[PDB]
Amino acid sequence: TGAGTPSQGKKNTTTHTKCRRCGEKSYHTKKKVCSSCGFGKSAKRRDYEWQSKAGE
Amino acid sequence: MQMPRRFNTYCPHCNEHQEHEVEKVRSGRQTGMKWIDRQRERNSGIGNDGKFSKVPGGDKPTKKTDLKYRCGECGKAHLREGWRAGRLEFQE
Amino acid sequence: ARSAYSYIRDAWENPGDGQLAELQWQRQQEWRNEGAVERIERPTRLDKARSQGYKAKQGVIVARVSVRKGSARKRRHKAGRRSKRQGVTRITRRKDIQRVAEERASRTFPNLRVLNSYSVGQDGRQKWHEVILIDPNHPAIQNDDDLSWICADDQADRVFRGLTGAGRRNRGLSGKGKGSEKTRPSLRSNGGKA
Amino acid sequence: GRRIQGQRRGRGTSTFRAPSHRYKADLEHRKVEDGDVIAGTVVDIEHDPARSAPVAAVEFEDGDRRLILAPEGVGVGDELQVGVSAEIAPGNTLPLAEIPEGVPVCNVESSPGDGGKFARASGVNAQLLTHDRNVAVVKLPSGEMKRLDPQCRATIGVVAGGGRTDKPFVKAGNKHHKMKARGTKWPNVRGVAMNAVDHPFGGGGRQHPGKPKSISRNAPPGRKVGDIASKRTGRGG
RNA sequence: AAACAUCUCAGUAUCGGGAGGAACAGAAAACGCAAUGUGAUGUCGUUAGUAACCGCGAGUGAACGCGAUACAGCCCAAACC
RNA sequence: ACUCGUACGGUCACUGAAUCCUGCCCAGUGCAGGUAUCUGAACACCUCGUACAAGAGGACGAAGGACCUGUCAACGGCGGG
RNA sequence: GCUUUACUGCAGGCUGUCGCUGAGGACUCUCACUCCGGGAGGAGGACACCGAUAGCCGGGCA
Ligand SMILES: [Cl-]
Ligand SMILES: [Cl-]
Ligand SMILES: [Cl-]
Ligand SMILES: [Cl-]
Ligand SMILES: [K+]
Ligand SMILES: [Mg+2]
Ligand SMILES: [Mg+2]
Ligand SMILES: [Mg+2]
Ligand SMILES: [Mg+2]
Ligand SMILES: [Mg+2]
Ligand SMILES: [Mg+2]
Ligand SMILES: [Mg+2]
Ligand SMILES: [Mg+2]
Ligand SMILES: [Mg+2]
Ligand SMILES: [Mg+2]
Ligand SMILES: [Mg+2]
Ligand SMILES: [Mg+2]
Ligand SMILES: [Mg+2]
Ligand SMILES: [Mg+2]
Ligand SMILES: [Mg+2]
Ligand SMILES: [Mg+2]
Ligand code: NA
Ligand code: NA
Ligand code: NA
Ligand code: NA
Ligand code: NA
Ligand code: NA
Ligand code: NA
Ligand code: NA
Ligand SMILES: [Sr+2]
Ligand SMILES: [Sr+2]
Ligand SMILES: [Sr+2]
Ligand SMILES: [Sr+2]
Ligand SMILES: [Sr+2]
Ligand SMILES: [Sr+2]
Ligand SMILES: [Sr+2]
Ligand SMILES: [Sr+2]
Ligand SMILES: [Sr+2]
Ligand SMILES: [Sr+2]
Ligand SMILES: [Sr+2]
Ligand SMILES: [Sr+2]
Ligand SMILES: [Sr+2]
Ligand SMILES: [Sr+2]
Ligand SMILES: [Sr+2]
Ligand SMILES: [Sr+2]
Secondary structure, three states: OOOOHHHHOOOOOOOEEEOOOOOOEEEEOOOOEEOOOOOOOOOOOOOOHHHOOOOO | OEEEOEEEEEEOOOOEEEEEEEEEOOOOOOOOOOHHHHHHHHHOOOOOOHHHHOOOOOOOOOOEOOEEEEEOOOOOEEOOOOOEOOOOEEEO | OOOOHHHHHHHOOOOOOHHHHHHHHHHHHHHOOOOOEEEEOOOOOHHHHHHHOOOOOOOEEEEEEEEEOOOOOOOOOOOOOOHHHOOOOOOOOOOOHHHHHHHHHHHHOOOOEEEEEEEEEEEOOEEEEEEEEEOOOOHHHHOOOOOHHHHOHHHOOHHHHOOOHHHHHHOOOOOOOOOOOOOOOOOOOOOOOO | OOOOHHHHHOOOOHHHOOOHHHOOOOOOOOOOOOOOOOEEEEEEEEEEOOOOEEEEEEEEOOOOEEEEOOEOOOOOOOEEEEOOOOOOOOOOEEEHHHOOOOOEEEOEOOOOOOOOOEOOOOOOOEEEEEOOOOOEEEEOOOOOEEEEOOOOEEEEOOEOOOOOOOOOOOOHHHHHHHHOOOOOOOOOOOHHHOOHHHOOOOOOOOOOOOOOOEEOOOOOOOOOOOEEOOOOOOOOO
């Protein structure tokens, strides 16, 4: 069984969903953690300086 | 090679020829308080210590004479260039 | 004449001698059984607390904090490092234990601000410090001429920014002349070389 | 290289844990106040998933229903005793002090009241040899002379299930089923059969440990493989 | 650094914590143009690529002072009550 | 974690059902044990040095090594004349 | 990426020493501290654990 097309058919699991806090479809319904805003992980909002060029 | 323990030659101090005694220069002990000694302790820590992680080099097949020439009358010594000698034994 | 305080002071110059020695031997047994931060009714070293600003008043709190003794609890490099940045055992942190203690105390009492702290001993595996904290919201303090300054907005979370006596000393701000070229006015403004 | 299998173990991930949620009970001796006024009746004999040996369910006078590490020869209806004055009969538990020298015991406590630590496997038994006011000498299954506090409790008799080891597994499938009842990763791939990156013995055209197998006690994890601090090897000499 | 380990890149990127409208510093156990002299602290210009560091290699690199900006000095602990 | 486990256990390795068997080698390397003597760091101690300190030397000496022994179903070896 | 008796280091283990740490070159004790016990109490004990440092080993890792 190939890793390509044939294995794409088994994908019918729901993981990332609309997030209650930020509105993005990044709330992982299995981990109960938003990969976009950190909801479920931290009270503070997920943020990182590498999300932009260093001197900006 | 052989060499006379004492012989007449020029004494740069008396400024005239006089009897001298030849002696192989004996190494003097270190005090461990020279600047280099303190730099080894200041700069050596965790990991490699640069120049202080290097170890003693090799040896030349033959070394040069390392002698002192002491004036028999004023007691002062002077140094001279040395020459490669596999062995140096004094006579008397 | 000598104050009664001078006697507590003089006792603590040699915590390992006299009655104080026996007291510590007894006390630590109980301290080892207490938590990381225990609020206490009265300072153990009265002379020191009063000297640092303590007052027997509403809004003044004292707490004893214990911290594990020793160097840094550092994790070894998982990625490439030149010999120089591979050390793990002899590396120590840049904040002293007294400062780590002041911060834990202040976290326990989120509404209070650290005024100062002092040492109350240690055993072979931990150190204890007592920390004086002030309630900037209590009127008994807002009306005190010696402590109301700590009620200002810019004094909020002062301990976390190094504004403590222990904070300032650890930052190398003691000397006003030689040796403080890279500590004053701040470690950061000097490129972090102090 | 990469961490070896022995190192993956310590992390205690599912692959290496024992099926605890399936285990029955902790067969520790009952805790008696004193006097031995504790007796129960064997209400049933059960299989113990964690030891491949049988265990007995006992109902005690005071109303406690607990599984017990059963010796050989215990059956339903039989009455068991646990205390200093318990009768010297197979299946009863009492401190070594009260036990007559020369009597096989099992589930021997290491420290009085711990519940039992030694001689708990199928068909094994410790052998109480010497008594005293300060030290009871027991000979454990490995044949070692152990000095114990005479206050250490034990059960008279040998453990049930003896001889379980006499019959060969015959099939890999049988080994399999038993392994699924333990905290062990099975089957076993030889170190020599792996790539150099995976084990000290991996690599090389043909298979062979490119090094002596007797490793020092001081060796770090990841390197301590093969024959650990062997005092000797082979069958000769 | 024409490799590279001290050094460099650099206390930079990035990470944890925290305050403000600005922060931090700050009224000498200072300075040491050594003096019959200066007089809290930032910052700007300069001192200066100087002193100092350094496989004394490549490189790293201040301060006092001076000219400016703005200026401001106070409160406890204890003694005695 | 192993482990509601305790030597009929479980960890670490090698060989790879049964059957008939599995010789010689402990010098080197590995492991392990022992060790009169030798060697063997720091702190403390002693001598010199310094009104102190740096430092030089000494006495003591742990593991380790030297040295002895055990061990090949331990790495491996079993040639030329 | 991999190897090793390549160079240089780093974890880790063993070992000594100092602190924890007490009383009367071998010793006793209990009071810190450790372990067992539901508890009383028992076992151990200034050792061990832990912090610091020193020597040895150290492709396990860079
Ligand atoms: Cl010569
Ligand atoms: Cl605070
Ligand atoms: Cl098995
Ligand atoms: Cl001046
Ligand atoms: K580099
Ligand atoms: Mg007043
Ligand atoms: Mg049990
Ligand atoms: Mg399984
Ligand atoms: Mg296999
Ligand atoms: Mg392969
Ligand atoms: Mg490998
Ligand atoms: Mg093979
Ligand atoms: Mg380069
Ligand atoms: Mg600033
Ligand atoms: Mg060069
Ligand atoms: Mg720099
Ligand atoms: Mg200056
Ligand atoms: Mg095979
Ligand atoms: Mg095969
Ligand atoms: Mg416990
Ligand atoms: Mg490598
Ligand atoms: Na230095
Ligand atoms: Na706080
Ligand atoms: Na280059
Ligand atoms: Na290169
Ligand atoms: Na350098
Ligand atoms: Na001038
Ligand atoms: Na051999
Ligand atoms: Na590659
Ligand atoms: Sr397949
Ligand atoms: Sr297909
Ligand atoms: Sr699916
Ligand atoms: Sr969470
Ligand atoms: Sr962020
Ligand atoms: Sr240094
Ligand atoms: Sr070093
Ligand atoms: Sr040569
Ligand atoms: Sr806050
Ligand atoms: Sr148990
Ligand atoms: Sr228990
Ligand atoms: Sr191999
Ligand atoms: Sr043999
Ligand atoms: Sr002014
Ligand atoms: Sr066979
Ligand atoms: Sr050998």
